[PDB]
Symmetry: C5
Subunit: 52 residues, 5 copies
């Protein structure tokens, strides 16, 4: 019953930490950006590899 | 009549939240950046797929 | 005479807002980054289109 | 024995500085992002070189 | 003699401003990120041009 509510809450937690009262938000923000950038780096590596 | 005004306001809201008094601006800022980065990642994926 | 001074000031304004006393700097900072990312996205789109 | 603990701590240090109490977090955050972007730039250079 | 020390200091200055006490760090941080992104944009342009 409330199983789904927990999951819903988990979703909220994921979206609440990134906006937590503490300025640590910038840290998470920094990680998400870094991760996305890393993914791009990997994609570029894969592109180089795939093409060559 | 004021229909357009509401839309205009909606535009303002979109541009006001990103600069809301709260430091949560960084959170939104983080999301826009993440989304843009994600789009790039997808584009790169599409490039890999299209080329290969 | 002072025409050029106004332009010089305009240049300063462009470089002063991004560093305005208010923490809104992050908002502008966010936009410049988003715009640059958007340009990259467009470039990638153009690359996909050009190649394919 | 505690050798591994030191390494574990070193890992924590790497993840603690990026979130240090000071707002200098943004500086580190800036560097990680810059480094990732730089890597992308290099990758792009390598792509240009590899393709051409 | 102290010539090198000045250069060393210059290096420190470059790494001290990005982490200056003022929150203007975000402004510099913004510029480094924008510049890196711009370089990527240019690289992409060069890629489009080189390939096509």
């Amino acid at each position: 019953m409330e199983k789904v509510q927990y999951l819903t809450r988990s979703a909220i937690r994921r979206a609440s930490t990134i906006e937590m009262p503490q300025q640590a938000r910038q840290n998470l923000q920094n990680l998400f950006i870094n991760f996305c950038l890393i993914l791009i780096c990997l994609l570029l590596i894969c592109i180089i590899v795939m093409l060559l």
